[PDB]
Amino acid sequence: GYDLSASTFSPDGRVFQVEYAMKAVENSSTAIGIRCKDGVVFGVEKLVLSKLYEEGSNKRLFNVDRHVGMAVAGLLADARSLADIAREEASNFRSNFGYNIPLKHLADRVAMYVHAYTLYSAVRPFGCSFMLGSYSVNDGAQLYMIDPSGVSYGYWGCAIGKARQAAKTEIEKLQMKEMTCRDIVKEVAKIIYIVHDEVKDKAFELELSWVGELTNGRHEIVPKDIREEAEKYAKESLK
Template identity: 60%
Template structure:
């Protein structure tokens, strides 16, 4: 485990350990690594998205821990890692898609949506007052 390895260097995304590690980023990556696999396939007539689903607890209500999300009529997203973080990212992607359509009268291009969403995720690695997304 990574518990205790930060020795005070794991309190912020802006703090490097003496050996050059940023523990907050490593913790976020560990959350993704411990999650199920996500897979997306592009076919000639569409796309196929699948996620590996774990039942973490018998107390968890079935179908409440979704990891595939609609973003708009033309876009969707699958996530690995922390579902709560994924929901934040999906909400931002939905906002980006909606605002683009309102401003330009057309659906957002996939690469533009990806760039805008990635920029949002990246912001959470730049400041000590927030933690990086583990999704």
């Protein structure tokens, strides 16, 4: 069998271990990011597998630098390991060059780290796609996504996990190029509630964060009040 090692090509020139890691990602619940005029907003459908867990357990949104947020989907231990890697890369960059790491360079470096785990029988590919979001006055809003193969692209809007296509289809309805973060949070909540499959999993929490000119370029959790009003708007739109 040609699918036991990331050091083995298939006869068709595929690396099946990477595709299986992508399948591990595609089994996870959905996260979305949308870049707009003055920042980037993240939302994640965070499935609650037991009512015994605290509201807030298993965050899928991470701060990797003060100006850079991270949203993950897939096997959560792997994603958190990559978030620690991203944090280390950002710290080393700041220590060496003396300013905040540009998002594109951070994306490229972490993507190359992910890629390094796709060449060898000694390690397995990461089972976690993740999003990177950032804002600065000089660079504006930037949103990148990295998959288990190590590919890295910039996006206006992106979705990862099991309902990726439905989310992208909803995002396409937005004129995100002309909207502000205060407008976009409502729409993010709306699409997450729309694409959430309430029949097969009964309860989820919405986690929302953003980074943009309204936070002076700091990545932060969405204030509780904006989260509940966004949820209320989403619920009534769900009507």
